Subunit: 191 residues, 4 copies
C-alpha cells in the first residue's frame, strides 16, 4: 500500500522517468505513492558548472525508507553502477540494515543511459544492495508497453551522448507499467 | 500455493540442500511442495568416471515449470555460474518465455561451493535468467538461522576442495528458512 | 602469439562474429589464430529440426585451451547467460583449473542477441568463469574511432562485441557490428603479441 | 612502470590492505608505486563522530589517474557495491572517459567486508566501471601456492584480495589475507612492467 519512488537525477531524465513510474503506481487502488529524491551530493557550484537540472522533489532521509511497502529506485547509469549520489544515500542505510527494517519489502529499479551501455549492470548492481536489505526484487520482464534498448531488468530511457534526447512515449509507458506492476504487487501483499 | 524445488546436483550437496528447502516450504499451510531435478546431461559413463552421486528425484520437464507458483532453483557453483546441466535445462524454456508462462511467479536460488569463491556470482547470474522470464526474485537477506560464507542472495553450503564436507546444521536451517520464507510468500500471493 | 577464437553458435550469428574476430586478429603479424567451436549438445535430429546451422570450424577439446596465449570466447546470449553448450564445455576445464593451465592468459568475450536485452550480463557472467581461471580480462571499452575499419561506429558495447539477430533470427551482422568484432580480435591479438610475443 | 594504489577506507582495513598491495608491487624492479586515497565525502565532525580513521596517504584527483600504467582500486564492500566515496570519485572521471585516458591500462581490485557477504559483487561491479574506461582487468584467480609469501594460503577469492573486519570492525587483516594482497600487487606490477615496461 505505501509506495516510494526514490530517485537520483542530474539532468532530468530520471526525474521524468520517476513521474511516469509514480503515475503507473497511482493507477492501483490501494497504493499511496510518493516521489522523493536523494540529496545532491555535489555543492550547487559544481552542479551548475556541469549543467545540472535543479531538482524540486522533497529530499528523502535514509530512515524513512522503512515506512514504505515498496520502493522503486531510479538512477542514471554511471559506468554500469548507480550514481555516487544514490550510492552515498544507500550507504547511510546501515542502521536500517542492522534493524532489518527493509526486510521482505518490494524493491524495483529504473535507469537511464547516454551514449549507451551499462544500463543492465546499473540495475543488477543496484539489486545487490536491495538483496542485502532482504528486499524482494521485482524485474519487469517482457511485458510492458510493450518492447529499443529495453531490458527485462527494469525501465530505462536513452538520453543520448548529448543528453538532449527526452524519454519516448514507449519508454514512459514501460515506466508507468513498472510503477503499476509493483504497486499492485505491494497492494496484493500489504494490501 | 504450488512450490517447486528444482535442482542440479552431481555429488549430492545440492540434493541434500534441496531436501532441506522442501522441508521448510512444507511447514507452510497452503504450500504443495515437490522436488525435481534437471536431467543429467553427461552420459552415465562419464558421470560414474567423475565419481558422481546418482540422483533419484523425478526429472522435471522445462514445460511443467509453468504449473508452479514459486520455483526454488538449486545449482552447484561452476566457476561463478550455474551448472551446464541447469543452463541446458533453462535454455529449453524459450517456448515458455515467448508465452510469458513464468511471468510474475516467485523465484529463489540456492547453491553450493567447494574450495571457495563464486557462490554469489552463481546466485546473481541465475537471477538474471529468472528476470528474463519476468519472475519475482526472492533473496534471503540476513534472517535466517541465523548467519561462515553465508550470503543474503540465497542459502549456500560448503563442500570443501575435497567435496567431502556435508552441509552443517546451520546451513540446513538457512535452507529450511529459505523454503519456508518463499512458500509463505507464494501462499500470501496465490494463496 | 597463439590466439584461439572459441565459440558456440546455433543459428550462425556468433559464427559470423567469430570469423570477424579472427579476421581482425590476423591483422597482427606474429599472431597465430585458429577458430574452433564447442560441441553441440543437442542430438543432430533435434538440432536440424530446430533449423540449427551446420558449421565448418573444428570442434575444440577442453585440454587444448592450455595451448593458447589468448582465448576469445563467443556465445549467444541465453537469458543473460552464456549458452548451455558453452557452459557444459567450460564445466570440463576443471583439470585445467587445478593445474593453473589458463592462469594469466588473455581472455575476451563477444556475444549476440535476438532483441538486445541481457547481452551485458552474458559477457560479465562469462568474465566470472575466466577470472576463476585467473585469466586477464579484455573489455573493448569505447575504442578510438579510427581503429575501426568502418567509419561512424557507435559506442555502447564496452564489455565486448555484440550483434542483433532480430526476434526472428533472420537478421545478420551489419558491417558496423562486424567492424567492432574485427577491432576486438585485432586489439587482443595485439596484446597477446606484446605479451608473448 | 607507474602503479597507483587508489583506495577508500573509513576504518582502516582497506588502508592496511592498500599498504600490503603497494609493498607487493614494490618487489617488482622498475615498478614505481604510489598509494593515494579518494576524498572522504562525509564532513569531518560526522566522520570523527563515527570513529572514522584519519589517514596519511595523499588525496588523489581524478585527472592524475591518467598518469599511471596500472591502477589497483581498493574499496570496502558496501552492500555488495564499492563505497559512495569511491563511486563519487569515479563519477568524476567523465573527462578521462571522453578522451580515452584510461584506455587499455591495467586495473585490478581488492576489498574488505565485515562478515563476508557481497565481497564478490563489490569487485565484479567495480570491474564494470573499469571496463567502461576500457581498462584491462586483472583477477587474481587461485595463484601458485609458492608465489605467496605466507605458506598455506587458501583459495576462494579469485576476483581480488579481500579481508574480514568482523561484525565489530575490530578484526584486522591476517598475515594470510595480507599475503594475498601483497601477491596481487606484485602480480599486477609485474604485468605493468612487462607491458610498459
Ligand atoms: C560519470 C558518468 C558516467 C556515465 N556513464 C554512462 C554509461 O555507463 N553509459 C551511458 O550510456 N551513459 C553514461 N553516462 C550518461 C548518463 O547515464 C546519462 O546522462 C543519464 O542517464 C542522465 O540521467 P539524468 O538526467 O537523470 O541525470 C554517464 C554520465 C556520467 C556523468
Ligand atoms: C567445473 C566445476 C566448477 C567448479 N567451480 C567452483 C567454484 O567456482 N567455486 C567453488 O568453491 N567450487 C567450485 N567447484 C566445486 C563445486 O561447486 C562443488 O563440488 C559443488 O558445490 C558440489 O555440489 P553437488 O554435490 O550438488 O554437485 C567446481 C566444480 C566443478 C566440477
Ligand atoms: C533459450 C534461449 C534464450 C535466449 N535469450 C535471449 C535473451 O536473453 N535476449 C535476447 O536478445 N535474445 C535471446 N535469445 C536469442 C538468441 O540470443 C539468438 O538466438 C542468438 O543470438 C543467435 O546467435 P547464434 O546464431 O550464434 O546462435 C535466446 C534464445 C534462446 C535459444
Ligand atoms: C553502509 C555500509 C554497508 C556495508 N555492507 C556490508 C556488506 O555488504 N557485507 C559485509 O560483510 N560488510 C558490510 N559492511 C561492513 C564494511 O564492509 C566494513 O566496514 C569495511 O570492510 C571496513 O573497511 P574499511 O575499514 O577500510 O572502511 C558495510 C558497512 C557500511 C558502512
Amino acid at each position: 500500500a505505501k509506495v516510494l519512488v526514490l530517485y537520483y537525477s542530474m539532468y532530468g531524465h530520471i526525474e521524468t522517468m520517476a513521474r511516469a513510474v509514480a503515475e503507473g503506481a497511482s493507477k492501483v487502488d490501494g497504493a499511496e505513492v510518493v516521489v522523493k529524491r536523494v540529496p545532491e551530493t555535489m555543492p550547487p557550484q559544481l552542479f551548475e558548472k556541469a549543467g545540472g537540472k535543479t531538482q524540486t522533489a522533497p529530499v528523502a532521509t535514509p530512515q524513512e525508507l522503512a515506512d514504505y511497502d515498496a520502493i522503486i529506485f531510479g538512477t542514471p547509469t554511471r559506468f554500469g553502477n548507480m550514481s555516487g549520489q544514490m550510492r552515498t544515500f544507500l550507504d547511510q542505510t546501515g542502521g536500517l540494515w542492522a534493524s532489518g527494517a527493509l526486510y521482505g519489502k518490494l524493491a524495483s529499479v529504473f535507469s537511464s543511459t547516454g551514449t549507451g551501455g551499462g544500463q543492465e549492470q546499473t540495475i543488477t548492481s543496484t539489486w545487490t544492495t536491495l538483496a542485502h536489505h532482504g528486499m524482494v526484487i521485482v524485474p519487469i520482464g517482457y511485458a510492458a508497453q510493450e518492447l529499443r534498448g529495453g531490458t527485462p531488468y527494469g525501465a530505462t530511457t536513452i538520453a543520448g551522448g548529448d543528453g538532449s534526447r527526452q524519454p519516448s512515449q514507449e519508454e514512459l509507458s514501460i515506466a508507468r507499467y513498472q510503477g503499476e506492476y509493483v504497486a499492485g504487487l505491494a497492494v496484493k501483499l500489504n494490501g
